[PDB]
């Protein structure tokens, strides 16, 4: 009574979506290195880039 989910068909063949443990981690914060909205202007000025 404390633990099991109250259901009619014990041993069901197809479990529902909500009664199964899901996996919801944190939203992956991605650090973009170099925003290219002003970086493609730097190369078109003539400076070739390197490093990084």
């Amino acid at each position: 009574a404390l633990t099991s989910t109250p259901r009619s068909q014990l041993n069901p063949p197809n479990w529902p979506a909500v009664q199964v443990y899901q996996e919801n981690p944190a939203p992956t914060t991605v650090l973009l290195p170099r925003d290219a909205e002003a970086e493609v202007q730097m190369t078109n000025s003539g400076a070739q880039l390197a490093g990084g």
Binding site: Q48, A50, G51, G52
Partner: protein, 48 residues
């Protein structure tokens, strides 16, 4: 008659210029961080 052979000094080049080659792109060296592997050295073909 015998004349001595013409003297020749097969030594290294001055300053070993020609032992190592950058500034001929393709087979040039890189200097990059380990985490990134993007070189800080790219050459131009016409740059001595």
């Amino acid at each position: 008659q015998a004349a001595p052979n013409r003297p020749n000094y097969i030594g290294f080049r001055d300053n070993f210029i020609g032992l190592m080659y950058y500034n001929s792109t393709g087979n040039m060296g890189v200097l990059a961080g380990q985490a990134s592997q993007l070189n800080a050295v790219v050459d131009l073909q016409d740059r001595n």
